Amino acid sequence: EFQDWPIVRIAAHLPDLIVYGHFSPERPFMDYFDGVLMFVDISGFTAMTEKFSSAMYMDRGAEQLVEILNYHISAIVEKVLIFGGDILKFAGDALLALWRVERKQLKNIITVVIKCSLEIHGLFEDIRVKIGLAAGHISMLVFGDETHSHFLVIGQAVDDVRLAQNMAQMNDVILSPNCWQLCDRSMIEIESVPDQRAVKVNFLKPPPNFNFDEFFTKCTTFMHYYPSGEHKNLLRLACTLKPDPELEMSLQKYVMESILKQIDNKQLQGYLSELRPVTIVFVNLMFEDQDKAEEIGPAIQDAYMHITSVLKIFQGQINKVFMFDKGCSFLCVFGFPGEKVPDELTHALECAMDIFDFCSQVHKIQTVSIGVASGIVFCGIVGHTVRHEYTVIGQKVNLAARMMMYYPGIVTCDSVTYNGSNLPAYFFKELPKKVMKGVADSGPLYQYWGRTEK
């Protein structure tokens, strides 16, 4: 069975949620379902990346980093896949996976996902991970324009797995309060988490009669894309995809053009693994706690239509979009594969202020925040052969990320960007530097005030 078609290579960059969906061209598109979510904190990615920036690695730091990272990441991915999970996105500090099933089956699936989580820690019993799990209703949002598509999962189950994540320490498996209350408590031994309603999993103690293999196989009954039969030994049914122009047209909208060129063998397969000077523009769009997903979707769509238009003007791209706690965030980048223009820093700032101005006027968006940082960041395809994504990793990525969170409502920039721009000082304001989660001495942080006082 020949399986190396372009459509198959494109599908490697996408979850089954997108590959095997069949939904309208309307944007935004929204769908609703139930499932179990898994968030694997891999940090040790942004910790290690800056070790490989040193001269000890003799200009092969990027190639060495992608190698060892994929070694560990791909092992996590294999575990997720063989347990029936769907890896939704990679984000440098973690991956998010989904077990979509009917509500009546969440109880049994939570057990599958807990066993999966425990075997993932088994792979690493320095290098360790933290796992959060949640279960309940999930909303999917698809937004984009006629040639680009993006997706997000939204809902309390998403926010639940967010908070379960941040409690875990190395080797921990934290269950969301709803996950704990929907799970098979007769089989899961838990313990308190101080003044948090989540719980930590200590042991999986099944009845004397219980055989997980038989249990798991019956659970696969409910998995609408688990490989079986002649394809029992495939990690993804997506590997069996055959040419289909209409489907490929839809799927390629989700993938960055430079990635498509590699998939088409018009670019060296190692061209995208690099430690590169870029400028990160991290945009955050905060909505109110009361907002429903049906209001958030149209707002993100309207925001995105402007963001992409400005990014193309100033020659930037969207690398990642996230959402948790009513904040939708766009990881934008300037200066990656063929986009290194001489005045990158000035354009990043003006693009940021432009995005800030417009999105601040979109209804239902209560606050816009943008952090800008410039420096060496790792760029590469991270994951497994069958499931991988282009991702940027580095401390300047994390700095832009916390800038937009710790300095809401304004456009902030780092000292590199400030000094390097061909703009005068009064366009800026030096800021009170704040204690920021796992961030070194930033250097001076600045607000991009603009060309006028008003």
Ligand SMILES: Cn1cc(Cc2cccc(F)c2)c(-c2cc(Cl)nc(N)n2)n1
């Ligand atoms: C690797 N990764 C990180 C995130 C952001 C996130 C979501 C939930 C809890 C967290 F702690 C962090 C996502 C993600 C993917 C999709 Cl499809 N939708 C949304 N909303 N987020 N992927």
